[PDB]
Amino acid sequence: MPAIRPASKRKPPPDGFSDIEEDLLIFANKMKDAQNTPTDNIPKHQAQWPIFQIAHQRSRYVYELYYQKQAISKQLYDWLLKNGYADAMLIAKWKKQGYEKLCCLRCIQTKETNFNSTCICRVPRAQLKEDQDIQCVNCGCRGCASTD
C-alpha cells in the first residue's frame, strides 16, 4: 500500500529501484523544498505552480525511463505508478497524440473553465501574438502544445 507500513510489514520494491532511488529522492526533496518555499513575495496561484512543475518532472522521468530509454522493468514501472512516484493519468495523456507535452490534467479539464475551453497554454504559439508571454494561472505553463 501507499499508506506507510511499520517496517516488518514492509514489502521490498522490485529490482532496479536501487538504481533509480537517487533520482527519485532528488525529486522527493525538490518537492519538500517546494512545500517550504516562501509565498509572501509572489501571488497565490503562483505559490501553487512549483508542485505541478515538479510533479510533471518526476512523472516525465519515470515515463521516459520506461518508454523511451528502456531502463526499468515493467514490474518496476507498474510499481512506481502504483506507489505514487509518477502520475498515471498524466502519463496516459502523454501517450495520447496531441498531448505529448501536457503540463497538467487541470489544463485540459474543459468542464472547469468559463466557456468550456482548455487553457491558453494548450494553444499553438503560432496563433498567438508575438511577445505575448503566457504563464497560465493553473500551473504557470508557457506553452504545452506538441508543436511548441
Partner RNA sequence: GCCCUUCGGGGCAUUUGGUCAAUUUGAAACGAUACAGAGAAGAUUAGCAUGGCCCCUGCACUAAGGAUGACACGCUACUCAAAGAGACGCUACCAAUU
- Burial (Cβ within 10 Å: 0-12, 13-18, ≥19) of residue 108: middle
Tell me if 103 is assigned to a ligand binding site: yes
CA distance 57 to 78: 18
For 35, left (φ over 0), alpha (ψ -120 to 50), or beta? Answer: alpha
CB of 138: closest distance to Zn ion in angstroms? 5
User: What is the Cα 21 distance to its own chain's centre?
Assistant: 18
CB of 95: closest distance to RNA in angstroms? 10
- Burial (Cβ within 10 Å: 0-12, 13-18, ≥19) of residue 119: buried
Q: Which does 45 bind (CB under 5 to 8 A by kind): RNA, Zn ion, none?
A: RNA
54 binds Zn ion (CB under 5 A): no
97 binds RNA (CB under 7 A): yes
Binding site for Zn ion (CB under 5 A): 103-104, 107, 119, 121, 136, 138-139, 141, 144
Binding site for RNA (CB under 7 A): 40-45, 96-100, 108, 110, 112-115, 117-120, 122-124, 127-128, 134, 136-138, 145-147
Question: Would you list which residues are annotated within the binding site for Zn(2+)?
Answer: 103-104, 107, 119, 121, 136, 139, 141, 144
